[PDB]
Structure formats: C-alpha cells, structure tokens
Amino acid sequence: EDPPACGSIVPRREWRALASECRERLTRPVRYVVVSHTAGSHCDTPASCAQQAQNVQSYHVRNLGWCDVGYNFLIGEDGLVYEGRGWNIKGAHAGPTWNPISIGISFMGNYMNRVPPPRALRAAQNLLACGVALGALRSNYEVKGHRDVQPTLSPGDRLYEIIQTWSHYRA
Amino acid sequence: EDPPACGSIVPRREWRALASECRERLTRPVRYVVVSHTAGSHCDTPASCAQQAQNVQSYHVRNLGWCDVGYNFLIGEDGLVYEGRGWNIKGAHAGPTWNPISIGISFMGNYMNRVPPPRALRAAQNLLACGVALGALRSNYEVKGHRDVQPTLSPGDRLYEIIQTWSHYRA
Amino acid sequence: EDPPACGSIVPRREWRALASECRERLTRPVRYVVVSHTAGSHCDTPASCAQQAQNVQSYHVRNLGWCDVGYNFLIGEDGLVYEGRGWNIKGAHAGPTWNPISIGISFMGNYMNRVPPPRALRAAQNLLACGVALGALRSNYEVKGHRDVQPTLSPGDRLYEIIQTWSHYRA
Amino acid sequence: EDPPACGSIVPRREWRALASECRERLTRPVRYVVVSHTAGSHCDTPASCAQQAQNVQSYHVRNLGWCDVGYNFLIGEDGLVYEGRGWNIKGAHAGPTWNPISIGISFMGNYMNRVPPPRALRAAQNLLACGVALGALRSNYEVKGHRDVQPTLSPGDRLYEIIQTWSHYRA
C-alpha cells in the first residue's frame, strides 16, 4: 500500500528455500505478533544462518508436512532477517486460534540461557517497524510471547524477558 | 530507549569505535550521496567486520590525524551497516567540494575485481531509504561514484557498474 | 450445575456488530464493576439502540483502532442490555489497573443532565444479578463509578448520583 | 543566539502542588503531544488558576490515588502554563499506549460549547515551541486530540476543532 520498500530481508531464493505450497492469506493489517525461538541451533554468519533457516524450513515441510517453513520471518544472530511466509500468508507457529490473526517471527537459537545479540534484537524491531510502514501490521500492533498464547517455554526465558520490555508488548 | 535505528545500524559503541571529536555539522536534509570502497580487506561476519570498521577508523585517526573515521557510514559483506560519523557530521571521504554537501557511505573491501554480496547492496539502499524517513536525505537525492567526483579508482569497477544501474543514481 | 436463563441480553449478531479481535481473558469471578456512560447520543428503541451500539463500536474500532468496543456490556434507554466484549473478555474502559479486574458496563447516553429511565436502570441491576447467578461476578462484587477510577465526567452527574446509593457501591 | 530561551511556566511550589512521587520517565525527544481539557471549570487569574491546579491534582492524587497530577502541563485561562509532571515524567492522561510516548497538556475548563481565549491558546503554542527548543519534543512532533486516542469528548468540540488547524496536528 505504502511507498517505502522496507528494511533488509534475505529473500527466499537467497537462503535456498524450497518453494511454498501455502495459499491462505491474512487480512491486512494484522494486529498481533507472536515471538518465538526455534529452540534449535544458532548461527552468527550470513552463511551459517542461511543454512539454518533452511534446516528449519526443512523440518517443517519434510517432517511435519507443512506447506512451508512455519514462521512469517526468522531472525539470525548474524543480525539478519530471513524470509518465511512473509507478510501476506498465514503461518503455522502459534496454534489455530492465533495463526489466522498474527505474524510469527522466530529467533533462530534456544534462548533459555542466552540473550540474542543486539543486532538480532535490532533486526526484529525494524522488521516490525517495516510491517507498520508497509501497512502489513496495525500501527498499534501488539507483540505477544509464544508462551502467552500456547503452553511452552518458547521463546525462552531470556528472550522472553527482553521482549517484555518492548513498547508494543502486551502480555 | 525507544525502537532502534531503521536500517539496523551497528552503533559506534557496538563495533568498539573511539569517540568522535568532530564538530562541523551537515545540513540535513542533504542532496548528495557518494559511494566508495575502503580498499582495505573485506570481512563477511559480524565479528570480522567490527574489527575492520575499527581498523579503518584507527587508521584515519591514529595516523591521518582525523577527528573521526572519515565516512558517514560503512557497509560490511555481512550485510550490516556500521555507523561512522552518522547523518549529522560533515564527513571526510570526497574532498572540499563534496564532503560538506553529501553523505558518504563506504563498502568494506576492494571492489575493483569483486562484486559485493546482494545483502550488502540491500543494507546500502535500505540505509538510504531510512535516511529520508528520519529526514537526513532529500527525497529526490542523487548518488554519485567516488570516482565520479575525485581522481580515484574507488569504488572499483565492479561496484561502480552496479551503482550505475541504480534508480536514484546520477551523473 | 445450576443454570439460570437470566440473559436478557441482545447478542452482537443481533445488533449487527463487527467481529471482535480481542483475545485477552478476564478471570471469573470478577470482583469489580465500573459504570460509565457513552457521553454520546442516547436511543429509546431496540432498532436505534442497535444502531447506536453500532456507532459506539465503530468509533472504538475504526477511529481508535481497537480490537472491539471497549465495554463488556452497554445499557440502552430502550431497557435492553447490549452485549459488548461480554463476561469473559477483558474490556478497555477504565485503564490498565481496573480493566483486567472489572466488568465495564456503560449506559448509552450522556447523563450530566438526564437520569436514565427506570427501565434502563432495571436493565443494569438485573444484568449484574445475572452475572452473579452465572458466577461471572462475585456475589459480593463492588461497583465503582467511572470517575472514581479515572479522571472523567463519566458516568454523568445524575447517573453518578444514583449509583452512589446502590447496595454494591463502594467508596 | 544563546541557550536558555523559552516559555514561562508557573512552577509546582508556586502553585503549591503536593510533592510528586512518580518515577517513570519519558524518553527524549518525545514525538507526541496529546491535548485534553479538564472537563471541569475554568479560571482566569493567577490566583484562581493556581487553585484550579491544586484541585485537579487533589482528585488525581487523593481520589484516584495517583502519584501526581496526571497531565504534564495545564493551561489556565489566566494565560499561564502550570507545571504538570514536566517534560520528563510519564503522565496518566491518555491510556497506556500513549502515556509512555506523549506529553500531555490539559486546558483547565470544558470546551464543548466554549472556546479558550487567545492567551491560553498562546501559552500552549509557546509551551510547544519551548518543548522543541529544549529538545523535549521532536521538532516534527505530532498533536492529537484526546478523543483521537481514547474514547472521550475531551478536549471539547470547540477546542478540538481548533487544534485540528494546528501545524503539528496529525489526524
């Protein structure tokens, strides 16, 4: 809807993503953002992190039979944003009540005992700012933790504490 | 304190920069943008690249007497943007004529025979977009090649042919 | 397992209300009840009151970009109780400290110089009785006036006057 | 041409405010100004208005039990600005989405059918020019009407109507 093409996202073709088979859309503008962690291995290079975003799309498509990597976006400790289902497609990351009404972004790693570095954190916020800018998210969007909407450890205590300090965070 | 800088810029402090001692101020919103390469080693991980930003600054300050690292902004092959002098302070990257009326961004590496990764080209443009938003660049701003305004090879034949392809490029 | 058919409430479907997008829950039995007035135009018939509810919701949803009309229930001067966020969804009518521990019912009208007609008042008391039979409210719930918890003229002076006399009212 | 240069404000002691006790801080520079009116009575003498101030504060501190008057600044029709919570302390005047990112200013009176006089209008636009000079407010800050972000008639049709003409009004 709006002119400013936004942030910096590693496109699907760049991290070598299997093609999506997903077709259902979200109604723009979206009101909620659920933050999670892959609880998998972390990476801190554009190289390892492309691999990673690939291993995760993989486990989701090849092992759980999803139409594509479950999150709308992933975040690398290389401080880069990875492209998933994107802004317009419904994701599979927070159960049936929430998947139809939110954008799910997952930090690649397990933040039970680690805080993601500032660049990781920075990517995520810009991403959200971009979402608003784009008209994808409501200007007064709300950020929820995974655990606030499903029973789980995600996004990890550390990262959990951190997103609780964010201006759009509503528990 | 509030959301970070659009463009996800690595702050002076995060790459361990020496404090700047420059005072001369630019008049945001600026009209020109000049692209150059450091002609130093390239780096491609957040680690490698912080050290390189540190390196180039140490050079400019410890050795060329400069008040701060010359450039307004530096770009790494890790695809991150490194804060240099910023939006407000006159740089030292294109001489008397151009240092006061343009913002200088520099790609870390020699790009005479290497093209830099697309993620670098991305942080660059997104860098500029976020320049109008925060309002440091004039919306209709123009891009010039370091060699388009000084007797220099920089930014290298490869980078240079690309920035030529650009939209808000010029002359 | 004792069910009363105490619900003489007009469902949203019946007043042609837009779908709510709220998901935050109230934990019953709720201890507090806050009374406000729209401060807007009042209605005296089931058909215009349905229209008025629509309006109140439109303002909160389109104008203030809220997930749904802020009150749990609305009382029309037509003597009917209009369903808002209902008994189990945290309203948005008295701030961060009261919203999550109270039911916010609001009288559709401006009561700074009118008293609501007896039937509107009967409607409200019976609504509360209802909520007690269901267990949604504590049998010993406390009623506050809007101005008692936030700076507002709400619920209007003559209405404020009346609820102060009420059995469940509390300092 | 030299530092300390803007707007006259009646300080707390001068009007006998109760010692504030609020600790939470706004982050400067602030982007939003939310305009409200007290919804009570006006005043037009340094004597009455300073009395006015106290009352308002009494309600918010005695009655609502808050840590200090809700607004950051009040305008009296006496033509003076009464120090509210200052440029640095989060106030309670517009709900939790805006309290942490706005400066809230309230005209002391009710402006539904009545408009405030040239001088209150001047004290207010002087306070803002001053907020900008101090870097308490962003240079390109935005002004909202209270009713634009909360359900309320505040700031009154006549006043609301007026601020809409304002240079920094953002619908």
Ligand SMILES: O=C(O)C1=C[C@H](O)[C@@H](OS(=O)(=O)O)[C@H](O[C@H]2[C@H](O)[C@@H](NS(=O)(=O)O)[C@@H](O)O[C@@H]2COS(=O)(=O)O)O1
């Ligand atoms: O712009 C707003 O005024 C506004 C934005 C949203 O619709 C909503 O939440 S948000 O910024 O998190 O998106 C918000 O509702 C608030 C409400 O303002 C608060 N009290 S109130 O002002 O009296 O209404 C409080 O209850 O928090 C609400 C959010 O609650 S939550 O979504 O259940 O977490 O209004």
